[PDB]
Amino acid sequence: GEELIKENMRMKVVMEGSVNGHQFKCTGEGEGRPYEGVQTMRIKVIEGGPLPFAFDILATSFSRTFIKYPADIPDFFKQSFPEGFTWERVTRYEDGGVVTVTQDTSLEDGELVYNVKVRGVNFPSNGPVMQKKTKGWEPNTEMMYPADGGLRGYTDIALKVDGGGHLHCNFVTTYRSKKTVGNIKMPGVHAVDHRLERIEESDNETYVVQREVAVAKYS
Numbered sequence: 604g605e606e607l608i609k610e611n612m613r614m615k616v617v618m619e620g621s622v623n624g625h626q627f628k629c630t631g632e633g634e635g636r637p638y639e640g641v642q643t644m645r646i647k648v649i650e651g652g653p654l655p656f657a658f659d660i661l662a663t664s665f666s667r668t669f670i671k672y673p674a675d676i677p678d679f680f681k682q683s684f685p686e687g688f689t690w691e692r693v694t695r696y697e698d699g700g701v702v703t704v705t706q707d708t709s710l711e712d713g714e715l716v717y718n719v720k721v722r723g724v725n726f727p728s729n730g731p732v733m734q735k736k737t738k739g740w741e742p743n744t745e746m747m748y749p750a751d752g753g754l755r756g757y758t759d760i761a762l763k764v765d766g767g768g769h770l771h772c773n774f775v776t777t778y779r780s781k782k783t784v785g786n787i788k789m790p791g792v793h794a795v796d797h798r799l800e801r802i803e804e805s806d807n808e809t810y811v812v813q814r815e816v817a818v819a820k821y822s
């Protein structure tokens with residue numbers, strides 16, 4: 604069931620949520636080479652735009668099938684098809700902000716389909732996120748631990764702040780397979796290096812293109 608994930612894959616994302624009670628809907632289309640760990644997505648804000656807050660806090664919610672794994676480490680994500688997987692995340696910012704996210708990943712006719720639900724709360728009004736004074740994420744490494752037929756990920760990420768400085772943020776992610784009929788070979792502890800870099804922005808961040816390169820490695 605890893606021969607369902609081809610050299611080239613396209614994806615669709617629909618994202619709904621609120622940050623500090625401001626409601627929005629986003630859609631995205633992209634492609635990547637999941638064995639090379641590289642992917643790009645074109646994201647439109649279609650409702651609630653232009654967003655009051657830094658789009659950066661949504662950037663990480665928009666794709667685990669496109670992680671480069673060596674032969675030596677089993678790919679939890681690619682093995683989950685055709686049924687796919689879910690993830691749940693809570694992110695905590697040092698200055699008070701909290702974001703909780705649920706993602707449903709499905710495969711429908713050889714396109715990856717993502718449904719993402721966001722809620723952000725308690726961001727300080729005069730802090731850099733609500734003031735849209737962020738310059739994207741520093742490269743980060745996520746630690747992955749086996750847990751009950753799923754994975755838990757742990758990250759410390761640093762958000763670049765306008766005028767220098769980093770806004771520190773931790774999140775925990777639980778990845779669960781939708782695969783019931785069929786086996787998954789489970790990896791041990793390992794890390795994923797993530798580089799998420801914005802390559803395009805337009806009209807108050809109502810159109811965003813971002814590129815992620817993600818590589819699994821030994822610990």
